Design a protein around this motif. Structure first.
Motif, PDB file in Angstrom:
ATOM      1  N   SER A  95      32.952 -98.951 -57.492  1.00 24.77           N
ATOM      2  CA  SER A  95      34.107 -99.849 -57.513  1.00 24.77           C
ATOM      3  C   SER A  95      33.688-100.922 -58.581  1.00 24.77           C
ATOM      4  N   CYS A  96      32.384-101.177 -58.539  1.00 25.12           N
ATOM      5  CA  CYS A  96      32.069-102.476 -59.566  1.00 25.12           C
ATOM      6  C   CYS A  96      32.022-101.740 -60.987  1.00 25.12           C
ATOM      7  N   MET A  97      32.316-100.703 -61.297  1.00 20.83           N
ATOM      8  CA  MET A  97      32.254-100.107 -62.650  1.00 20.83           C
ATOM      9  C   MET A  97      33.636-100.182 -63.177  1.00 20.83           C
ATOM     10  N   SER A 104      36.305-102.352 -62.002  1.00 22.23           N
ATOM     11  CA  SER A 104      36.611-103.884 -62.132  1.00 22.23           C
ATOM     12  C   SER A 104      35.811-104.567 -63.198  1.00 22.23           C
ATOM     13  N   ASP A 105      34.734-104.000 -63.576  1.00 27.11           N
ATOM     14  CA  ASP A 105      34.041-104.478 -65.117  1.00 27.11           C
ATOM     15  C   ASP A 105      34.789-103.869 -66.189  1.00 27.11           C
ATOM     16  N   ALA A 106      35.250-102.784 -66.203  1.00 26.23           N
ATOM     17  CA  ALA A 106      35.808-102.205 -67.310  1.00 26.23           C
ATOM     18  C   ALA A 106      37.241-102.604 -67.803  1.00 26.23           C
ATOM     19  N   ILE A 131      40.477-106.579 -71.125  1.00 28.53           N
ATOM     20  CA  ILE A 131      41.237-107.851 -70.761  1.00 28.53           C
ATOM     21  C   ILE A 131      40.628-108.841 -71.774  1.00 28.53           C
ATOM     22  N   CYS A 132      39.381-109.173 -71.471  1.00 25.15           N
ATOM     23  CA  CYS A 132      38.875-110.461 -72.168  1.00 25.15           C
ATOM     24  C   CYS A 132      38.693-109.946 -73.779  1.00 25.15           C
ATOM     25  N   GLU A 133      38.734-108.779 -74.192  1.00 27.25           N
ATOM     26  CA  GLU A 133      38.974-108.444 -75.397  1.00 27.25           C
ATOM     27  C   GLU A 133      40.219-108.598 -76.177  1.00 27.25           C
ATOM     28  N   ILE A 144      41.571 -96.450 -74.244  1.00 26.66           N
ATOM     29  CA  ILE A 144      40.445 -95.832 -74.634  1.00 26.66           C
ATOM     30  C   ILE A 144      39.191 -97.027 -74.672  1.00 26.66           C
ATOM     31  N   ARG A 145      39.642 -97.905 -74.730  1.00 19.27           N
ATOM     32  CA  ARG A 145      38.545 -99.246 -74.701  1.00 19.27           C
ATOM     33  C   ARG A 145      38.122 -99.300 -73.372  1.00 19.27           C
ATOM     34  N   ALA A 146      38.959 -99.259 -72.566  1.00 21.89           N
ATOM     35  CA  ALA A 146      38.601 -99.291 -70.922  1.00 21.89           C
ATOM     36  C   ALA A 146      37.647 -98.142 -70.706  1.00 21.89           C
ATOM     37  N   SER A 176      35.823 -96.320 -72.800  1.00 24.29           N
ATOM     38  CA  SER A 176      34.696 -96.701 -73.579  1.00 24.29           C
ATOM     39  C   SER A 176      33.648 -97.283 -72.890  1.00 24.29           C
ATOM     40  N   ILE A 177      34.185 -98.384 -72.285  1.00 22.64           N
ATOM     41  CA  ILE A 177      33.242 -99.327 -71.279  1.00 22.64           C
ATOM     42  C   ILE A 177      32.437 -98.835 -70.284  1.00 22.64           C
ATOM     43  N   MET A 178      33.583 -97.765 -69.600  1.00 23.68           N
ATOM     44  CA  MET A 178      32.682 -96.989 -68.662  1.00 23.68           C
ATOM     45  C   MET A 178      31.715 -95.952 -68.863  1.00 23.68           C
ATOM     46  N   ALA A 195      29.576 -96.570 -71.341  1.00 24.76           N
ATOM     47  CA  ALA A 195      28.257 -97.282 -71.520  1.00 24.76           C
ATOM     48  C   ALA A 195      27.925 -97.768 -70.152  1.00 24.76           C
ATOM     49  N   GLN A 196      28.523 -97.868 -69.249  1.00 29.68           N
ATOM     50  CA  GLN A 196      28.074 -98.136 -67.880  1.00 29.68           C
ATOM     51  C   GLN A 196      27.380 -96.991 -67.309  1.00 29.68           C
ATOM     52  N   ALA A 197      27.904 -95.941 -67.680  1.00 26.30           N
ATOM     53  CA  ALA A 197      27.517 -94.475 -67.085  1.00 26.30           C
ATOM     54  C   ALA A 197      26.244 -94.031 -67.647  1.00 26.30           C
ATOM     55  N   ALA A 214      20.033-100.140 -66.537  1.00 29.53           N
ATOM     56  CA  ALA A 214      21.096-101.517 -66.179  1.00 29.53           C
ATOM     57  C   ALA A 214      20.455-102.775 -66.056  1.00 29.53           C
ATOM     58  N   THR A 215      21.215-103.493 -66.384  1.00 24.34           N
ATOM     59  CA  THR A 215      20.500-104.992 -66.592  1.00 24.34           C
ATOM     60  C   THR A 215      20.474-105.518 -65.113  1.00 24.34           C
ATOM     61  N   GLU A 216      21.822-105.362 -64.263  1.00 20.41           N
ATOM     62  CA  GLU A 216      21.815-106.165 -62.965  1.00 20.41           C
ATOM     63  C   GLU A 216      21.497-105.515 -61.748  1.00 20.41           C
ATOM     64  N   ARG A 217      21.141-104.360 -61.866  1.00 23.33           N
ATOM     65  CA  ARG A 217      20.604-103.265 -60.956  1.00 23.33           C
ATOM     66  C   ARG A 217      19.766-102.200 -61.082  1.00 23.33           C
TER      67      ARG A 217
HETATM   68  C1  LIG Z   1      35.660-110.663 -71.048  1.00 20.02           C
HETATM   69  C2  LIG Z   1      34.866-110.350 -70.160  1.00 20.02           C
HETATM   70  C3  LIG Z   1      33.674-109.513 -70.360  1.00 20.02           C
HETATM   71  C4  LIG Z   1      32.823-108.731 -69.288  1.00 20.02           C
HETATM   72  C5  LIG Z   1      32.879-108.382 -67.669  1.00 20.02           C
HETATM   73  C6  LIG Z   1      31.882-107.797 -69.822  1.00 20.02           C
HETATM   74  C7  LIG Z   1      32.198-106.462 -69.575  1.00 20.02           C
HETATM   75  C8  LIG Z   1      31.208-105.167 -70.199  1.00 20.02           C
HETATM   76  N1  LIG Z   1      30.069-104.823 -69.451  1.00 20.02           N
HETATM   77  C9  LIG Z   1      29.647-104.005 -70.381  1.00 20.02           C
HETATM   78  C10 LIG Z   1      28.471-103.168 -69.862  1.00 20.02           C
HETATM   79  C11 LIG Z   1      27.871-102.860 -68.560  1.00 20.02           C
HETATM   80  N2  LIG Z   1      28.378-103.223 -67.606  1.00 20.02           N
HETATM   81  C12 LIG Z   1      27.651-102.555 -66.557  1.00 20.02           C
HETATM   82  C13 LIG Z   1      28.383-102.855 -65.161  1.00 20.02           C
HETATM   83  C14 LIG Z   1      27.698-103.357 -63.960  1.00 20.02           C
HETATM   84  N3  LIG Z   1      26.523-103.652 -63.901  1.00 20.02           N
HETATM   85  C15 LIG Z   1      26.049-103.751 -62.701  1.00 20.02           C
HETATM   86  O1  LIG Z   1      24.855-103.917 -62.363  1.00 20.02           O
HETATM   87  C16 LIG Z   1      27.405-103.518 -61.827  1.00 20.02           C
HETATM   88  C17 LIG Z   1      26.991-102.503 -60.806  1.00 20.02           C
HETATM   89  C18 LIG Z   1      28.421-103.358 -62.785  1.00 20.02           C
HETATM   90  C19 LIG Z   1      29.222-104.578 -62.871  1.00 20.02           C
HETATM   91  C20 LIG Z   1      29.991-104.951 -61.393  1.00 20.02           C
HETATM   92  C21 LIG Z   1      26.668-102.024 -66.979  1.00 20.02           C
HETATM   93  C22 LIG Z   1      25.540-101.257 -65.994  1.00 20.02           C
HETATM   94  C23 LIG Z   1      26.531-101.904 -68.390  1.00 20.02           C
HETATM   95  C24 LIG Z   1      25.527-101.523 -69.614  1.00 20.02           C
HETATM   96  C25 LIG Z   1      24.304-102.390 -69.462  1.00 20.02           C
HETATM   97  C26 LIG Z   1      24.573-103.629 -69.428  1.00 20.02           C
HETATM   98  O2  LIG Z   1      25.133-104.335 -70.417  1.00 20.02           O
HETATM   99  O3  LIG Z   1      24.267-104.369 -68.331  1.00 20.02           O
HETATM  100  C27 LIG Z   1      30.290-103.604 -71.670  1.00 20.02           C
HETATM  101  C28 LIG Z   1      29.851-102.765 -72.603  1.00 20.02           C
HETATM  102  C29 LIG Z   1      30.036-103.013 -73.943  1.00 20.02           C
HETATM  103  C30 LIG Z   1      31.076-102.047 -74.961  1.00 20.02           C
HETATM  104  O4  LIG Z   1      30.447-100.949 -75.158  1.00 20.02           O
HETATM  105  O5  LIG Z   1      32.173-102.255 -75.047  1.00 20.02           O
HETATM  106  C31 LIG Z   1      31.397-104.577 -71.320  1.00 20.02           C
HETATM  107  C32 LIG Z   1      32.555-104.805 -72.257  1.00 20.02           C
HETATM  108  N4  LIG Z   1      31.966-108.238 -71.127  1.00 20.02           N
HETATM  109  C33 LIG Z   1      32.688-109.138 -71.509  1.00 20.02           C
HETATM  110  O6  LIG Z   1      33.084-109.552 -72.726  1.00 20.02           O
END
Ligand SMILES: C=CC1=C(C)[C@@H](Cc2[nH]c(/C=C3N=C(/C=C4\NC(=O)[C@H](C)[C@H]4CC)C(C)=C\3CCC(=O)O)c(CCC(=O)O)c2C)NC1=O
Ligand SMILES: *CC[C@H]1/C(=C/c2[nH]c(/C=C3N=C(/C=C4\NC(=O)C(CC)=C4C)C(C)=C\3CCC(=O)O)c(CCC(=O)O)c2C)NC(=O)[C@@H]1C
Ligand SMILES: *C[C@@H](*)[C@H]1/C(=C/c2[nH]c(/C=C3N=C(/C=C4\NC(=O)C(CC)=C4C)C(C)=C\3CCC(=O)O)c(CCC(=O)O)c2C)NC(=O)[C@@H]1C
Ligand SMILES: *[C@@H](C)[C@H]1/C(=C/C2=NC(=C\c3[nH]c(C[C@H]4NC(=O)C(C=C)=C4C)c(C)c3CCC(=O)O)/C(CCC(=O)O)=C2C)NC(=O)[C@@H]1C
Ligand SMILES: *[C@@H](C)[C@H]1/C(=C/C2=NC(=C\c3[nH]c(C[C@H]4NC(=O)C(C=C)=C4C)c(C)c3CCC(=O)O)/C(CCC(=O)O)=C2C)NC(=O)[C@@H]1C
Ligand SMILES: *[C@@H](C)[C@H]1/C(=C/C2=NC(=C\c3[nH]c(C[C@H]4NC(=O)C(C=C)=C4C)c(C)c3CCC(=O)O)/C(CCC(=O)O)=C2C)NC(=O)[C@@H]1C
Ligand SMILES: *[C@H](C)[C@H]1/C(=C/C2=NC(=C\c3[nH]c(C[C@H]4NC(=O)C(C=C)=C4C)c(C)c3CCC(=O)O)/C(CCC(=O)O)=C2C)NC(=O)[C@@H]1C
Ligand SMILES: *[C@H](C)[C@H]1/C(=C/C2=NC(=C\c3[nH]c(C[C@H]4NC(=O)C(C=C)=C4C)c(C)c3CCC(=O)O)/C(CCC(=O)O)=C2C)NC(=O)[C@@H]1C
Ligand SMILES: *[C@H](C)[C@H]1/C(=C/C2=NC(=C\c3[nH]c(C[C@H]4NC(=O)C(C=C)=C4C)c(C)c3CCC(=O)O)/C(CCC(=O)O)=C2C)NC(=O)[C@@H]1C
Ligand SMILES: *[C@H](C)[C@H]1/C(=C/C2=NC(=C\c3[nH]c(C[C@H]4NC(=O)C(C=C)=C4C)c(C)c3CCC(=O)O)/C(CCC(=O)O)=C2C)NC(=O)[C@@H]1C
Ligand SMILES: *[C@H](C)[C@H]1/C(=C/C2=NC(=C\c3[nH]c(C[C@H]4NC(=O)C(C=C)=C4C)c(C)c3CCC(=O)O)/C(CCC(=O)O)=C2C)NC(=O)[C@@H]1C
Ligand SMILES: *[C@H](C)[C@H]1/C(=C/C2=NC(=C\c3[nH]c(C[C@H]4NC(=O)C(C=C)=C4C)c(C)c3CCC(=O)O)/C(CCC(=O)O)=C2C)NC(=O)[C@@H]1C
Ligand SMILES: *[C@H](C)[C@H]1/C(=C/C2=NC(=C\c3[nH]c(C[C@H]4NC(=O)C(C=C)=C4C)c(C)c3CCC(=O)O)/C(CCC(=O)O)=C2C)NC(=O)[C@@H]1C
Ligand SMILES: *[C@H](C)[C@H]1/C(=C/c2[nH]c(/C=C3N=C(/C=C4\NC(=O)C(CC)=C4C)C(C)=C\3CCC(=O)O)c(CCC(=O)O)c2C)NC(=O)[C@@H]1C
Lengths: 324, 57, 164, 162, 177, 172, 172, 164
Positions: free
Chosen positions: E49-51, E53-55, E60-62, E128-130, E132-134, E136-138, E146-149
């Motif tokens: 769910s966090c993955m 709402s961040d993607a 949108i911010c881009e 595709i950009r949405a 692509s962000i997921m 990177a999180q996967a 992961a930075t925050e967990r």
């Molecule tokens: C305009 C607003 C804006 C944002 C919100 C962030 C969004 C954001 N986060 C990450 C990148 C990431 N995002 C997460 C997500 C999470 N990490 C956690 O601990 C949580 C579980 C979860 C958020 C709830 C992870 C794990 C990564 C990869 C490692 C990291 O960067 O922390 C990327 C990857 C870059 C890419 O390849 O495109 C982006 C765009 N950046 C922005 O410019």
């Protein structure tokens, strides 16, 4: 037989002959003990309609023994049989798990309701039930709303009605009926627009775009076209189909304008002779004379008779001519 | 209804086969909409048709 | 293709949910049971030419009426097909050990088999005569493991219960 | 787009050919020069805001009537000054797109096709944009074959405006 | 539909061959690294769910012109659909990672998606950009980077499971392009 | 048609962005994979007549109904077109290998090929069998280290095999 | 295409009739407004670039998402197609003013224009407010007397504003 | 419920068939986890009144506006109902460990929680602040075993994801 003027009738010569004959009306609440030779016809007519002329082998049918027993007891056709049959595995295998979500909605409208989803909101009303409540309540929404109860009875089999004026949908959904139901000797796996693996009316069902009606059995019944957008915003490619508009100075010069669809384009049978050419058979890039069959044209009136001779003398056959 | 009048052919290069599998640099660049071109490549079909019918000038 | 993975994914897909903790605990048994189940799969791959000869020949001892004129084993080209009609069945048992579940049997062997074995007048009691002979001609110390001859024996009388 | 890879495929598909050594050598010339092209696009991206505000000021020193003359075409309002620095960023962004791709393909599709009807209708003159691009050529700070790659796509944009 | 074991069987049934021993070595290491696969799905589903709402917030911010009147995330009905258009992509990928084969997202998610999206007017380059962000999180949760967990696993290597899930996200982008 | 470098540019223009340093450094990794990619394409284009002919001959061995009188491949003109269709697909897969993405395989080969084969009566499932026999004939050749420096290129053979699966599910 | 003269002729041949005297009179009335009609078309033609380029500038100022990146008129390819479309609508309206009935505007400009913009992704409600701005810019510019003898000219600008209203409803 | 027994039996019941061989490998995976999951239920059953005491006021330390007139924690009595509201979710996490699946959570605690918490004006962000505190306060060898803390934390992320 084809045509629209011979027997002073036109719907039984579009493939709706055998569907225009049956009722299958189940004239009693429970099945009479001692006998089975009357309700077996009701059971099998429900199977050929709800599964859509699908083959069910006798071991596949024997999975669904319990249900067929309660309907033969004091229970009803719509809620205890057609709702139970659509929650079995023999239904979910072919129409749900093989497809995306919109393939499942288009086949539940065809099977359970006998019509077509017209517009994006008939899809979205049924898509939102799956996201919040799963499959077993997604099938309920086709039954327990205000469309099934006013059309079909409690004990009539849900016949086809998406072509007639009483189903107050549209006239674009009239043409979408003759893409889903392509005759009586056809099934859902056995028509070339959905091979039990895709969505039959995807771009045309959402945007309510009317299609040309091509009668099953006509010379050109094999006409099928692929989809690509054009225009740089949606990042599409030009040159696949023809336009559907006829917009410019070529609209009203050379008379009024028509849309012609051809299907059968082979490599022999081009020149002004009777026989195939002998020799190299292909040019240096070795593609074809027609790189794909099923070409479509946009042509004025004063160029319709020279085009017609170019189509037929080079092997093609005309599937549909609609005026634009 | 006045048909066209008859004229005689002449020997030319295009009346006779070239054997030419794998053509080279003097092959003259088929521009077709049977290759499904995008917007940047349908500009090149249009410029090639202008060059052929009109001049380059 | 029913198995342990495709039944906990279809359960999760039909509810629109992510794979829960139950779906991951169903695979820790599939990891545990795989060693017994894959051990019988390779014992049947490198021995099928001799089991099929032994199994099909037990058919023509209980049933010698097949060799008569007009019946299903009248000439040698039809006797050869009964060995093929059995060698088809041991392959689908070998597939059910590699997959894990009873997917390929009811999809490729059992589906519509009663129609084919009624029009062509093939008896079905001579199909169960071969598989039931293989199922009890078996040494779990010698031929397999102890726990591989319970997974191999389970798919055999599944085929018998289907054909009867 | 016209890239060095899609122009080697198109000349091989025109002859009905597999990818010979004529075409493998051409794609290999892209991979050799891509080391100098990808550092020019990285160095122009990271110093972009210094280049946009600089190049818009270079138009204002050279053609100072564009800040004084009233009318919607000129940079005399605050609205018309942000639309100028918008356009300088459009031209600088297409140059970086051509350096990562190789070949003047992104600006042939996104910028130059239909540009003359835009400048004619809204009364923008192409000498404002030449002066902006001649600032970026002289001020990007690159050197060697990295500056050779960047300046070859600056000069393509100038030659379509000139 | 077809997992890692059903993929082997249908390629042996094409040849009518028995599944012997030389083809069971890819399946004996599928099971030997079986706990790492279940440790990989658990790291996605636990913060899915966090993955999402961040993607789509990062999309949108881009591209801030998606939420303008006329954009495709303008209304509340359009943004709510995008928030599940990309939650159902992450769901079918975690089915594909669990089963070790891509035959469930390519048969229930990716089939006919490009025709569906241009019927609706969905901009695919932002879809595709949405995705692509997921992706990177996967890979930042399969590997514990992961930075925050940070999560609690045993010690070892999962660079083959990280690159398998990054190949499942790339065929999503190759389908709507 | 697009390559892999212009695929990431068409996506950055649609949001009006410069490419970030991560997308640049992911593109420069594709450049240093470039000599290993040209080895795979060279290995296929130099065996191209034997990829087609062997996997054809292996197809009419296990499917003799194709060349039996009445079959789809029975006559010289239909046999010549089955060999052309195998060569076309192997040609456009090797085009999508140097590009890096399958935009040239999609439009000018595969768009409308299920529709074409259904118009003619070609069995489209048998075409998918022949495409998967040219796949493992050329996956096996790209794994051959004859006349190459021994390094690791397992990630581009998993890419080349994916373009053969893309063409095989697109005709059935 | 038909004008106001041949429209009445074409409705009489279908019945096989002469023209009645009450139709020769109503056709002779629009001859007497001949010079007043040519003054309107000459006013719209002489300002044709300023009608379009001001209405477009006033369109992107209130809907700035059409030109910000990823919009439907963001690239110079697409932006020059938008300005081209606005002076196709203006050109076919002034053809209908000369003829007297919307047959040339209805056939070769408007029939299928709603289906064209739907199939491309262009917002049709934004093309309506681009047509409405050119109506108010050209009925105010046909209402000034500089150069024309002052009589009465109000029965014909109600017609010219009726052709712009016909075009703005057939884009949605 | 949703567990491993209720899933393979229902998919057997939804296909009209006996429990197959793949229906028994799944229960085998319940044997290989019960001894690594029931000690997470053992620890939570004897320590809950210290867990909900500190996880309940971690939300009141985070969202201090709730103790205002007109809010959800107006008086002391509505504070004590929130501690009762939190000591239900720890009780249902304990039941999901005992059953094995997430059935007790999404049928007694999740189903209908959107309609209730919108109506009575209860912020769900203070529920997930009280559940994310418990998930982070856990140490793996101190509070549980090495794999019991994987089971217990896999249900505290089902609660947070279902309320978001
Ligand atoms: C305009 C607003 C804006 C944002 C919100 C962030 C969004 C954001 N986060 C990450 C990148 C990431 N995002 C997460 C997500 C999470 N990490 C956690 O601990 C949580 C579980 C979860 C958020 C709830 C992870 C794990 C990564 C990869 C490692 C990291 O960067 O922390 C990327 C990857 C870059 C890419 O390849 O495109 C982006 C765009 N950046 C922005 O410019
Ligand atoms: C401010 C204008 C709005 C707008 C315009 C816009 N239109 C297009 C594309 C096409 N327009 C037409 C219409 C015609 N073509 C003709 O020849 C004639 C004469 C009869 C008409 C009425 C057609 C056929 C196209 C497609 C062909 C082409 O692309 O040139 C476009 C480009 C869209 C694209 O992605 O290709 C734009 C931008 N769109 C807007 O944003 C404004 C609201
Ligand atoms: C250096 C600044 C000078 C200047 C700039 C100026 N430009 C405009 C208006 C437009 N510029 C464009 C150009 C493009 N659009 C594209 O999409 C691309 C390719 C990516 C290009 C090159 C367009 C379409 C417009 C009109 C719409 C808009 O963007 O607002 C204006 C405003 C003109 C007007 O009438 O509004 C200005 C002021 N002018 C100067 O004086 C500076 C010297
Ligand atoms: C790479 C993705 C990770 C990583 C993975 C490892 N996990 C290892 C072992 C492991 N994980 C689990 C839990 C998992 N199995 C289940 O059955 C369930 C729930 C049903 C889950 C969540 C278990 C049980 C094990 C095995 C440990 C044991 O013996 O009990 C592991 C070590 C084993 C091996 O590699 O063979 C690794 C490497 N670890 C990492 O460091 C990265 C980040
Ligand atoms: C109405 C919107 C205008 C307007 C129109 C009037 N024009 C009148 C007379 C007139 N107009 C023309 C020009 C016309 N004839 C041509 O041959 C050509 C092109 C080559 C054009 C543009 C001429 C030559 C004449 C003189 C003929 C005559 O006297 O009719 C006119 C009559 C005067 C009156 O009765 O008011 C009108 C109304 N005048 C306006 O004030 C508005 C703005
Ligand atoms: C009572 C029904 C029987 C009997 C039962 C016993 N079975 C014992 C062990 C056992 N059985 C199996 C196979 C079973 N487990 C599975 O997971 C599956 C399929 C998925 C099946 C069919 C296994 C694996 C085991 C464990 C030991 C082994 O075989 O390696 C057993 C031993 C338990 C104990 O002694 O405490 C008993 C008593 N045995 C009998 O005598 C009656 C008749
Ligand atoms: C046998 C002589 C053929 C052959 C037959 C196959 N037919 C298959 C499927 C099928 N056939 C029909 C048409 C049939 N149903 C009717 O209602 C009528 C006439 C009124 C006819 C002729 C349909 C509708 C279907 C679809 C069945 C379904 O989708 O469930 C078929 C495939 C069965 C399957 O895929 O399960 C075969 C093999 N094939 C042959 O090679 C010989 C020549
Ligand atoms: C056989 C050893 C018995 C016996 C069996 C008969 N049952 C007959 C009809 C029948 N049975 C049921 C119950 C069945 N359906 C269910 O859904 C469930 C459980 C979930 C069960 C057990 C029903 C509902 C019916 C109604 C008839 C029908 O379904 O078509 C029956 C008569 C059949 C007929 O009348 O044609 C028999 C002979 N009866 C016996 O005497 C022995 C004890
Ligand atoms: C009468 C003035 C016409 C004419 C009429 C016929 N219409 C026939 C069938 C038919 N018409 C429609 C269109 C109508 N139904 C709708 O629902 C809507 C829109 C909401 C409209 C305009 C439909 C759908 C059908 C199919 C039949 C049905 O729905 O029941 C028809 C043929 C009847 C038949 O086939 O037996 C005729 C004769 N045709 C004429 O000759 C004059 C010009
Ligand atoms: C041997 C134990 C039997 C027996 C067998 C015969 N089977 C004959 C034909 C036949 N068998 C099948 C089923 C088989 N084909 C499959 O693809 C699979 C599963 C993958 C199986 C089990 C089919 C479909 C057919 C018909 C096709 C054909 O004719 O080749 C057969 C020939 C009879 C005939 O057609 O004249 C025989 C003799 N017969 C015996 O004597 C015992 C009972
Ligand atoms: C957000 C990431 C995107 C975006 C998303 C939108 N998607 C919209 C509608 C929509 N999407 C799908 C595909 C979806 N359904 C599935 O079954 C699967 C895979 C299994 C997926 C991915 C469908 C079928 C639809 C149709 C409408 C519906 O049923 O809800 C959508 C339209 C909402 C609306 O028109 O009201 C949006 C906005 N769009 C974006 O701009 C970003 C990039
Ligand atoms: C991969 C599946 C192959 C393989 C590929 C490798 N090639 C390596 C180096 C290399 N290759 C070439 C030839 C290539 N470059 C060209 O310009 C042309 C055509 C004109 C061709 C055919 C060259 C010149 C080089 C040296 C430059 C470099 O180092 O990149 C290479 C690196 C060695 C390693 O680390 O293993 C690999 C992997 N080699 C294989 O083993 C498989 C079969
Ligand atoms: C705690 C830190 C929260 C908070 C909680 C409050 N919940 C209130 C009432 C309430 N809660 C539930 C859900 C809960 N009750 C159950 O029986 C079960 C499952 C078995 C659960 C999860 C319900 C159904 C109700 C209404 C019935 C009842 O009052 O028990 C509540 C009282 C509000 C009121 O009724 O005015 C509070 C204060 N509130 C907070 O301040 C944070 C967000
Ligand atoms: C061979 C392994 C299989 C097979 C092939 C087969 N194909 C054809 C006919 C056509 N194939 C095409 C396809 C293309 N033409 C192109 O130019 C391109 C590039 C864009 C493609 C992908 C077309 C257009 C035809 C029809 C024209 C023609 O006849 O050449 C045939 C002949 C069918 C006929 O009856 O003429 C055959 C036999 N058939 C098999 O059975 C194999 C499985």
């Amino acid at each position: 037989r084809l045509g629209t003027v011979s027997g002073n009738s036109s719907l039984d010569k579009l493939g709706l002959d055998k569907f225009l004959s049956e009722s299958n009306r189940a004239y009693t609440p429970r099945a009479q003990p001692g006998f089975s030779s009357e309700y077996e016809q009701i059971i099998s007519a429900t199977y050929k309609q709800l599964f859509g002329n699908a083959y069910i082998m006798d071991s596949e049918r024997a999975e669904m023994a319990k249900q067929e027993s309660m309907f033969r007891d004091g229970q009803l056709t719509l809620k205890d049989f057609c709702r139970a049959l659509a929650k079995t595995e023999q239904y979910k295998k072919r129409f749900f798990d093989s497809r995306p979500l919109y393939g499942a909605i288009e086949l539940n409208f065809k099977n359970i309701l006998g019509r077509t989803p017209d517009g994006l909101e008939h899809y979205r009303a049924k898509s939102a039930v799956y996201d919040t409540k799963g499959y077993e309540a997604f099938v309920d929404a086709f039954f327990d709303d205000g469309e099934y109860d006013e059309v079909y009875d409690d004990y009539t089999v849900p016949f086809y009605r998406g072509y007639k004026t009483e189903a107050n949908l549209s006239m674009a959904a009239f043409t979408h009926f003759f893409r889903m139901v392509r005759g009586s000797s056809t099934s859902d796996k056995a028509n070339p627009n959905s091979m039990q693996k895709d969505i039959p009316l995807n771009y045309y069902g959402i945007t309510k775009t009317p299609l040309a009606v091509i009668a099953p059995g006509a010379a050109g019944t094999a006409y099928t076209e692929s989809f690509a957008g054009t225009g740089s915003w949606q990042s599409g490619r030009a040159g696949l189909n023809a336009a559907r508009v006829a917009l410019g100075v070529p609209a009203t010069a050379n008379g009024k304008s028509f849309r012609v669809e051809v299907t059968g384009y082979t490599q022999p049978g081009f020149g002004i002779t009777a026989g195939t050419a002998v020799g190299k058979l292909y040019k240096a890039n070795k593609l074809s004379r027609y790189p794909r069959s099923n070409k479509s044209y946009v042509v004025g009136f004063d160029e319709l008779t020279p085009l017609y001779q170019r189509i037929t003398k080079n092997g093609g056959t005309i599937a549909s001519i609609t005026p634009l | 209804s006045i048909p066209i009048l008859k004229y005689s052919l002449s020997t030319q290069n295009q009346r006779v086969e070239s054997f030419e599998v794998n053509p080279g640099d003097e092959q003259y660049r088929i521009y077709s909409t049977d290759s499904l071109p995008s917007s940047s490549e349908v500009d090149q079909i249009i410029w090639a048709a202008y060059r052929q019918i009109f001049s380059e000038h | 293709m029913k198995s342990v993975i495709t039944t906990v994914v279809s359960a999760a897909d039909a509810a629109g949910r992510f794979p829960s903790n139950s779906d991951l605990e169903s695979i820790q048994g599939n990891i545990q049971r795989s060693a017994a189940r894959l051990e019988a799969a390779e014992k049947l791959a490198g021995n099928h030419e001799a089991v099929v000869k032994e199994a099909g020949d037990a058919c023509f001892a209980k049933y010698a009426y097949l060799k008569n004129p007009g019946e299903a084993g009248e000439n040698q080209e039809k006797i050869n097909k009964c060995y093929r009609d059995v060698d088809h069945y041991m392959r689908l048992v070998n597939y059910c050990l590699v997959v894990g579940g009873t997917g390929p049997l009811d999809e490729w062997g059992i589906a519509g088999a009663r129609e084919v074995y009624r029009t062509l007048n093939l008896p079905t009691s001579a199909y169960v005569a071969s598989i039931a002979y293989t199922r009890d001609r078996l040494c779990v110390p010698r031929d397999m493991s102890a726990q591989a001859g319970v997974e191999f024996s389970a798919y055999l009388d599944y085929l018998i219960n289907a054909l009867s | 787009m016209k890239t060095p890879i899609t122009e080697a495929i198109a000349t091989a598909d025109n002859q009905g050919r597999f990818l010979s050594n004529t075409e493998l050598q051409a794609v290999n010339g892209r991979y050799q020069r891509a080391t100098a092209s990808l550092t020019a696009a990285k160095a122009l991206t990271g110093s972009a805001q210094r280049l946009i505000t600089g190049a818009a000021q270079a138009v204002y020193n050279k053609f100072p009537y564009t800040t004084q003359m009233p009318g919607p075409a000129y940079a005399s309002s605050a609205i018309g000054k942000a639309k100028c620095a918008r356009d300088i960023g459009y031209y600088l962004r297409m140059v970086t797109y051509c350096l990562v791709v190789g070949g003047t393909g992104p600006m042939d599709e996104y910028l130059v096709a239909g540009l003359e009807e835009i400048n004619r209708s809204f009364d923008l003159s192409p000498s404002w944009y030449i002066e902006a691009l001649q600032y970026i050529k002289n001020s990007h700070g690159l050197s060697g074959q990295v500056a050779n790659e960047a300046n070859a796509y600056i000069d393509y944009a100038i030659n379509t405006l000139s | 539909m077809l997992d890692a074991f059903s993929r082997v069987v249908v390629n042996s049934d094409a040849k009518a061959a028995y599944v012997g021993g030389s083809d069971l070595q890819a399946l004996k290491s599928f099971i030997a690294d079986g706990n790492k696969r279940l440790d990989a799905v658990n790291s996605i589903v636990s913060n899915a769910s966090c993955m999402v709402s961040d993607a789509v917030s990062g999309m949108i911010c881009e591209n801030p012109g998606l939420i303008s009147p006329g954009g495709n995330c303008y209304t509340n009905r359009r943004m709510a659909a995008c928030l599940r258009d990309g939650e159902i992509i992450l769901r079918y990928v975690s089915y594909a990672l669990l089963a070790g084969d891509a035959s469930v997202l390519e048969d229930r998610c990716l089939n006919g998606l490009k025709e569906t999206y241009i019927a609706l007017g969905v901009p695919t380059n932002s879809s595709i950009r949405a995705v692509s962000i997921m992706k990177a999180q996967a890979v930042a949760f399969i590997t514990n980077t992961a930075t925050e967990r940070k999560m609690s696993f045993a010690a070892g290597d999962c660079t083959s499971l990280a690159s398998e899930v990054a190949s499942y996200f790339d065929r999503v982008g190759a389908a709507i392009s | 048609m697009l390559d892999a470098f212009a695929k990431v540019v068409a996506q950055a223009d649609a949001r009006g962005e410069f490419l970030s340093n991560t997308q640049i450094d992911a593109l420069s990794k594709m450049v240093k994979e470039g000599n290993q990619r040209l080895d795979i394409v060279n290995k296929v284009t130099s065996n191209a007549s034997a990829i087609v002919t062997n996997s054809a001959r292996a197809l009419f061995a296990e499917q003799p109904q194709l060349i039996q009188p009445g079959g789809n491949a029975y006559t010289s003109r239909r046999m010549a077109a089955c060999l052309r269709d195998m060569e076309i697909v192997l040609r456009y897969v090797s085009y999508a290998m140097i590009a890096g993405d399958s935009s040239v395989l999609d439009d000018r080969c595969l768009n409308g090929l299920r529709e074409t084969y259904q118009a003619l009566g070609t069995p489209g499932s048998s075409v998918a069998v022949a495409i998967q026999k040219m796949k493992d004939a050329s996956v096996a050749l790209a794994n051959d280290t004859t006349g190459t420096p021994i390094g690791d290129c397992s990630s581009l053979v998993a890419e080349l095999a994916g373009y053969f699966d893309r063409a095989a599910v697109s005709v059935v």
